[PDB]
Scaffold this active site. Structure first.
Site, PDB file in Angstrom:
ATOM      1  CG  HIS A   1      -1.827  -1.255   1.208  1.00  0.00           C
ATOM      2  ND1 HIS A   1      -2.719  -1.573   0.208  1.00  0.00           N
ATOM      3  CD2 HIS A   1      -1.867  -2.282   2.090  1.00  0.00           C
ATOM      4  CE1 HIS A   1      -3.270  -2.746   0.471  1.00  0.00           C
ATOM      5  NE2 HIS A   1      -2.770  -3.196   1.607  1.00  0.00           N
TER       6      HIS A   1
ATOM      7  CG  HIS B   1      -6.166  -4.918   7.802  1.00  0.00           C
ATOM      8  ND1 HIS B   1      -7.481  -4.647   8.119  1.00  0.00           N
ATOM      9  CD2 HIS B   1      -6.201  -5.698   6.695  1.00  0.00           C
ATOM     10  CE1 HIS B   1      -8.275  -5.232   7.240  1.00  0.00           C
ATOM     11  NE2 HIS B   1      -7.523  -5.876   6.366  1.00  0.00           N
TER      12      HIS B   1
END
Lengths: 456, 135
Positions: free
Chosen positions: B16, B130
């Protein structure tokens, strides 16, 4: 034999020992291997003595014009019989297209050329086209995605189509050629002696009106197998304009990729008429279209009738809810043609997932790939998934990524997938929050069941 | 599963934060290559690891997806990002998976945990692991 490496930083010592492979292997693929102009001479020298080079793929290496020209020099020998070449995303510019263009004039054996992700511009494309038009060039497949081409490049491209009977695939997706450009390209195809097999114009500004021209192409080019038009504002009107051609008896189109095309349940309805009549259509994507449960119902009714032999259905992000799963459940239980169902990014919920499991758990089910990523799945669906994973024997891949599964749910899936009776080969769990317990249990699973891969 | 050389924080960063190419179809190759299976979707936050760690420092909030966890943190605000959407599969070769990318500016909530005492750099006691959501 092949030298095939991708996404690896090659140290000098590693490079030094791979070099000899460059002049020995028939296939040289070094995808994203940090290669630069500094190593282009080594490549060129190896290629010039390779007695049987058939494929060269250097995608995603920052070579730049100087590097690419250097590499190309390696293909400039009379015995070079290269068939496939990819310089995708290699920092090649329009200027650098001169040498590329020249090289094509003496490589009649070259059938495939990938130049996507290079800012060629209209001027570079023009230069390329000059080489493609050479009588000695017999290229059959050309990919030019993200090359910063405008509508002005369509005439040059059209002239190539009109002069090359061997053409099979043209990909110009992700270029702002727009309605005018698309029209010119289509007319070029209509006036071409080629038996095109694939036409890809995704994110090209294709409009509803363009669909009238495309309709004719689909109705006449009996050779056409793939039509990719995703991310274009075709709308339901566009669909209605295309169906007449898709329904033509001579059409044997195998793949229809129309994701995010502004289609609704209405256009879906027209498409279902095609599905019921054309057994040749094997792959369809309607992903990203606001089909809703009404569209899901029309698709399932069609998938339950003789004639529709669709093998892959991509319907992720179609605004489906748990209410459509009873329909899809019937399909998974009775349809013996559908092998892949990509239905991710839909609010199916546990209620919906558990319903799908009922149909999938039947004796004659054939589905082999199921995507349920980001479908609001929780531990509440795992008991059913676990049972289906033992009852069904056709599934080989299951994607449950982006779902909130916990210790309880994971344990349930593990209890089933660990068994010798479970034939699943891939369990995809990307983007999920892990607890130490969860990770430990699944790590062991991998070692206890060698035929099973647990992703992320 | 998660490559063994990465801690969960590093895996988070690999997926990410570090977008190795401007086009999803190319940036995703590195990620998908690790386990040879293309991700259905992947979001690249156009920020830095240090900047996300800062967000991990914002007041804890009950994770919207799992009320039993309170290790989530709302980003101070909108952040530029690129969402990669898988549109064309390629099981025989992940290098052939095609993605549609959508640039955007959106807020985000991240779940952060204590670093890996023996692998994560000590300068970041709490790290992102996460991406709970993008809105």
């Amino acid at each position: 034999q092949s030298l095939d490496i991708q996404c690896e930083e090659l140290s000098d010592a590693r490079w030094a020992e791979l070099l000899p492979l460059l002049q020995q292997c028939q296939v040289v693929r070094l995808d994203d291997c940090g290669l630069t102009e500094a190593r282009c001479k080594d490549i060129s020298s190896a290629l010039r003595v390779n007695p049987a080079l058939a494929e060269l793929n250097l995608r995603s290496n920052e070579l730049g014009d100087v590097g690419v020209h250097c590499v190309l020099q390696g293909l400039q020998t009379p015995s070079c019989k290269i068939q496939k070449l990819s310089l995708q995303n290699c920092c090649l510019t329009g200027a650098g297209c001169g040498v590329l263009s020249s090289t094509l004039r003496t490589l009649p054996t070259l059938q495939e050329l990938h130049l996507s992700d290079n800012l060629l511009g209209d001027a570079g494309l023009q230069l390329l086209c000059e080489g493609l038009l050479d009588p000695q060039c017999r290229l059959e497949k050309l990919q030019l995605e993200y090359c910063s081409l405008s509508a002005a490049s369509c005439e040059p491209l059209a002239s190539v189509l009109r002069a090359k009977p061997d053409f099979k695939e043209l990909t110009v997706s992700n270029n702002d050629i727009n309605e005018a450009g698309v029209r010119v390209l289509c007319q070029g195809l209509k006036d071409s002696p080629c038996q095109l097999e694939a036409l890809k114009l995704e994110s090209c500004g294709v409009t509803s009106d363009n669909c009238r021209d495309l309709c004719g192409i689909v109705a006449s080019k009996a050779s056409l197998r793939e039509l990719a038009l995703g991310s274009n504002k075709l709308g339901d009107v566009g669909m209605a304009e295309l169906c007449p051609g898709l329904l033509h008896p001579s059409s044997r189109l195998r793949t229809l990729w129309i994701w995010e095309c502004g289609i609704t349940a209405k256009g879906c309805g027209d498409l279902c008429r095609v599905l019921r009549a054309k057994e040749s259509l094997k792959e369809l994507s309607l992903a990203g279209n606001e089909l809703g449960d009404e569209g899901a119902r029309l698709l399932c009714e069609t998938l339950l009738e003789p004639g529709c032999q669709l093998e892959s259905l991509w319907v992720k992000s179609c605004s489906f809810t748990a209410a459509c799963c009873s329909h899809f459940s019937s399909v998974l239980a009775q349809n013996r043609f559908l092998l892949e169902l990509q239905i991710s990014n839909n609010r199916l919920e546990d209620a919906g997932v558990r319903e799908l499991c009922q149909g999938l758990g039947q004796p004659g089910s054939v589905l082999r790939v199921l995507w349920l990523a980001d479908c609001d799945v929780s531990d509440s669906s795992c008991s059913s998934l676990a049972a289906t994973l033992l009852a069904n024997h056709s599934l080989r891949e299951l994607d449950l990524s982006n779902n909130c599964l916990g210790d309880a749910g994971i344990l349930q899936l593990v209890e089933s997938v660990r068994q010798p009776g479970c034939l699943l080969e891939q369990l995809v769990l990307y983007d999920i929050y892990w607890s130490e317990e969860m990770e430990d249990r699944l790590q062991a699973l991998e070692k206890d069941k060698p035929s099973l891969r647990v992703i992320s | 599963m998660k490559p063994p050389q990465f801690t969960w924080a590093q895996w988070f960063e690999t997926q990410h934060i570090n977008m190795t190419s401007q086009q999803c179809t190319n940036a995703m190759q590195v990620i998908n290559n690790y386990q040879r299976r293309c991700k259905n979707q992947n979001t690249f936050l156009l920020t830095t690891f240090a900047n996300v760690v800062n967000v991990c420092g914002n007041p804890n909030m009950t994770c919207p997806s799992n009320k039993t966890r309170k290790n989530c943190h709302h980003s101070g605000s909108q952040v530029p990002l690129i969402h990669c959407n898988l549109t064309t599969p390629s099981p025989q070769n992940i290098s052939n998976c095609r993605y549609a990318q959508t640039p955007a500016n959106m807020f985000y909530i991240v779940a952060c945990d204590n670093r890996d005492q023996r692998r994560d750099p000590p300068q970041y006691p709490v790290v992102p692991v996460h991406l709970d959501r993008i809105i």
